[PDB]
Amino acid sequence: GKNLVYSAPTSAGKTLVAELLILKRVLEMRKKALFILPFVSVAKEKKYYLQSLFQEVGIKVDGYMGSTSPSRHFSSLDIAVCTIERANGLINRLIEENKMDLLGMVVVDELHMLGDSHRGYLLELLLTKICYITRKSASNAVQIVGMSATLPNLELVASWLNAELYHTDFRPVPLLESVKVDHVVSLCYETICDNHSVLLFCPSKKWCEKLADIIAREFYNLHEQKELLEVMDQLRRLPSGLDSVLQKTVPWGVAFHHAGLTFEERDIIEGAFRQGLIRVLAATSTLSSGVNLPARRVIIRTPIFGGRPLDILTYKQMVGRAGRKGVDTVGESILICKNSEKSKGIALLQGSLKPVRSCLVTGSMIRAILEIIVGGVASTSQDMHTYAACTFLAASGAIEACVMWLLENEFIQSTKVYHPTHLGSATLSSSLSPADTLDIFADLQRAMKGFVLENDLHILYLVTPMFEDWTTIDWYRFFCLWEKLPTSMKRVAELVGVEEGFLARCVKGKVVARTERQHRQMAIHKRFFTSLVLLDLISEVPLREINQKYGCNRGQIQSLQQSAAVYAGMITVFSNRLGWHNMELLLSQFQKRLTFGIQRELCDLVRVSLLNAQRARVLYASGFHTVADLARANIVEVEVILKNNMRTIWVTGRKGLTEREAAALIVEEARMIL
């Protein structure tokens, strides 16, 4: 239990040691074990893998990722496969409840994210809290395991965590990088004829789509069917339907994969590629850091990604997907280059990834100081400097500035001992950034004075996150929708701050320059557009109808859905801790409605993990209005309902599931819930 930090190339079973360590620790010490993954998709995949691997040893695995949380108390859990942000929140709650001793280990995957990133600083704060608590209160307290690619300063990380060091460059399928600069058709024919898959990485979504289209066209001109038809049918019966370009590309063993698709379409395509049904997959940079999707040959369109040379870490994790362990002998990663791009390509071929920074006046430092002070682990400046010493920044005088910032804004109170007042405790529990918590407090307080209960829009405006630009707003369509809005929605629009003058300015004149800090008035109108999108979402309108009405594709709609669900949960916890009972009561429902995009009636019916928003409606419209009512039903009835040996329905982390046993599992899990 002396911690550990090791690195190794992916596609070499590098997580096996971690799984072994969690198994041994959980079985011996009978203590919990977090498993921090960077992204929600890989987190879900790991959660399902661990569930399958440990279901036979009486180990409960259920993670805190995305907008979801385990249906059972954390006490019952044995392994929690959470994400970075939600793992930080979990550790904050454990510290708050003075039950940190339940934790036995914190396994962190993809530790290289500690460096430059908007979520790495959360990992740094999490690990710093682990180290500080472990050292202040002691051999076998809390083990930390790390993972990453080749890290230039991996030994620095091990020293910071006071852990071992193991670095090895060994992969069963030795990769053969080769840059080369007619013959394209011959190359495609000879690559496909070898009975191996190909993974292309293109910079643009549109260019990925078009390149997949031309490859499918060339395969058609130069020209298993049953399994490909099965995949096509699976794609057909989805809420977003089937994409026409994807329709004409899929049945030729060619497809595309980008953030524009929906999570279900991406999952279907990834599964088809994994089984070999899809031979060529044109993905984007997002898939590079996504699920484990090995390919015999990887190809990179151009090092220019988004008007800039491709990142070295991104390129490394792209080439890491070249080679199948068990069935393939060697792997190839081609990077086509041009006369002008030859220098950039040669630069990318050589050189390892850059060293890991710390990303620590800065909001990260304000957050860390708030976490320690509110958690009751560093109340005096004498020891807070010790926490600073524990940070990765130290191991590689802003505290006084940050502590004043918290006293200036009434996050903490001085007495020289420091304490939180109400917003310090409510800000930490909600896992909201202290910078945005002031605006959230001001907006929620203003809402409770004049709330509009006519519709769901005023509640949506308060749970709409504007921390990132999910889509480029088409202001002409927004103005048309505005002039077509009801009076009930226009009341909330005027209440929040939306003005027809600004909309008119944007409709014809160019987007107003937000050169001044007082011009958060632009954020209000973007937030109202987003809240209208969310209202259409939770009103259970189809994704395509939203896309036509608003211009946001289905992938962006789903991303906004997840962001709004997480933000609604966070705001609900904030209101609960602040003692706003009516606001919390109104916001409590919206987290699940936004997670699934359903109506109030289906909220109870979606507690069954095996029930989409569309599958909840067809069962609800039939007459099953409750999970208990589901438990009392024959399998044949639900099967005929779903209809109105072929694997046609898709569910996350599925198996050889068709509509026959899908009905069987719906009732079986309904019984389990009761």
Ligand X SMILES: COc1cnc(C(F)F)cc1-c1cc(C#CC2(O)CCOCC2)ccc1C(=O)Nc1nnc(C#CC2CC2)s1
Show binding-site residues for ATP: 8-15
- Give alpha helix (H) positions in 55-136: 84-96, 120-136
- Left if phi > 0, otherwise alpha if psi is -120 to 50, otherwise beta: which for 115? beta
Closest CA to 597 of 628, 637, 554, 640: 554
Among 45, 62, 85, 265, binds ligand X (CB under 6 A): 85
Residue 33, strand partner residues: 105
* Window 409 to 438, contacts with ligand X (CB under 6 A): 430-431
What does 544-565 look like in DSSP terms, one character per residue?
HHHHHHH---HHHHHHHHHHHH
Q: Chain-centre distance of CA 137, in angstroms? A: 34
Among 448, 504, 512, 523, binds a copy of itself (CB under 8 A): 448
Name every residue whose Cβ is closer than 8 Å to that of residue 137 and which is 6 or more positions away in sequence.
Answer: none
Cβ atoms of 366 and 435 within 8 Å: the answer is yes
Among 563, 575, 576, 612, binds ligand X (CB under 6 A): 563
Residue 166, contacted partner among a copy of itself, ligand X, none, CB below 5-8 A by kind: none
Residue 285 structure tokens: 């940079």
- Closest distance of CB 404 from ligand X, Å: 25
Q: Tell whether residue 623 is a contact of a copy of itself (CB under 8 A).
A: no
Between CA 625 and CA 634 the distance in angstroms is: 15
**Considering only 61-69, 173-181, 330-338, 452-460, which stretch makes contact with ligand X by CB under 6 A?**
61-69
Q: Tell whether residue 461 is a contact of a copy of itself (CB under 8 A).
A: no
Q: Tell whether residue 486 is a contact of a copy of itself (CB under 8 A).
A: no
Among 364, 464, 591, 612, binds ligand X (CB under 6 A): 591
Residue 148, contacted partner among a copy of itself, ligand X, none, CB below 5-8 A by kind: none
**Considering only 335-343, 378-386, 477-485, 561-569, which stretch makes contact with ligand X by CB under 6 A?**
561-569
Q: Tell whether residue 315 is a contact of ligand X (CB under 6 A).
A: no
Residue 467, contacted partner among ligand X, a copy of itself, none, CB below 5-8 A by kind: ligand X
Cβ atoms of 78 and 61 within 8 Å: the answer is yes
The SS3 call for residue 51 is helix
Among 183, 226, 416, 449, binds a copy of itself (CB under 8 A): 449
Q: Tell whether residue 97 is a contact of a copy of itself (CB under 8 A).
A: no
- Which amino acid belongs to residue 307? G
* Window 457 to 486, contacts with ligand X (CB under 6 A): 465, 467
Residue 397 structure tokens: 């005088």
Dihedral angle sign, alpha carbons of residues 639, 641, 643, 648:
negative
Q: Chain-centre distance of CA 298, in angstroms? A: 25
What does 235-273 look like in DSSP terms, one character per residue?
HHSSTT---HHHHHHGGGTEEE--TTS-HHHHHHHHHHH
**Considering only 364-372, 524-532, 566-574, 598-606, which stretch makes contact with ligand X by CB under 6 A?**
566-574
Among 111, 569, 580, 667, binds ligand X (CB under 6 A): 569
Q: Which is nearer to a copy of itself, 493 or 663 (CB)?
A: 493
Among 283, 299, 365, 452, binds a copy of itself (CB under 8 A): 452
**Considering only 118-126, 384-392, 402-410, 581-589, which stretch makes contact with a copy of itself by CB under 8 A?**
581-589
**Considering only 23-31, 203-211, 407-415, 451-459, which stretch makes contact with a copy of itself by CB under 8 A?**
451-459
Among 4, 59, 94, 630, binds ligand X (CB under 6 A): 94
Name every residue whose Cβ is closer than 8 Å to that of residue 298 and which is 6 or more positions away in sequence.
Answer: 198, 199, 200, 201, 318, 319, 321, 322, 331, 332, 333, 334
Q: Tell whether residue 553 is a contact of ligand X (CB under 6 A).
A: no
Among 161, 212, 489, 583, binds a copy of itself (CB under 8 A): 583
- Closest distance of CB 609 from ligand X, Å: 16
Closest CA to 612 of 591, 573, 642: 642
Between CA 110 and CA 211 the distance in angstroms is: 31
The SS3 call for residue 41 is helix
Q: How far is CA 570 from CA 360, 407, 531, in A?
A: 24, 23, 17
**Considering only 49-57, 374-382, 444-452, 612-620, which stretch makes contact with a copy of itself by CB under 8 A?**
444-452
Q: Which is nearer to a copy of itself, 224 or 601 (CB)?
A: 601
Among 62, 264, 265, 456, binds a copy of itself (CB under 8 A): 456
Q: Tell whether residue 93 is a contact of ligand X (CB under 6 A).
A: yes
Between CA 320 and CA 294 the distance in angstroms is: 8
Residue 452, contacted partner among ligand X, a copy of itself, none, CB below 5-8 A by kind: a copy of itself
- Closest distance of CB 496 from ligand X, Å: 19
Residue 105 structure tokens: 């280990």
Between CA 466 and CA 470 the distance in angstroms is: 8
Between CA 574 and CA 431 the distance in angstroms is: 8
Q: What is the DSSP letter of 323?
A: -
- Closest distance of CB 39 from ligand X, Å: 11
Between CA 59 and CA 82 the distance in angstroms is: 16
Q: Tell whether residue 189 is a contact of ligand X (CB under 6 A).
A: no
Among 24, 206, 308, 600, binds a copy of itself (CB under 8 A): 600
Cβ atoms of 81 and 35 within 8 Å: the answer is yes
- Closest distance of CB 186 from ligand X, Å: 46
- Closest distance of CB 417 from ligand X, Å: 26
Q: Tell whether residue 247 is a contact of a copy of itself (CB under 8 A).
A: no
Among 119, 491, 526, 549, binds a copy of itself (CB under 8 A): 491
- Closest distance of CB 424 from a copy of itself, Å: 22
Among 263, 470, 580, 596, binds a copy of itself (CB under 8 A): 580
Q: Chain-centre distance of CA 406, in angstroms? A: 30
Between CA 48 and CA 44 the distance in angstroms is: 6
Q: Tell whether residue 120 is a contact of ligand X (CB under 6 A).
A: no
Between CA 145 and CA 629 the distance in angstroms is: 45
Residues that bind a copy of itself (CB under 8 A): 447-454, 456, 459, 488, 491, 580-583, 585-586, 589, 600
Residues that bind ligand X (CB under 6 A): 64, 67, 69, 74, 85-86, 89-90, 93-94, 97, 430-431, 465, 467, 563, 565-567, 569-570, 573, 591
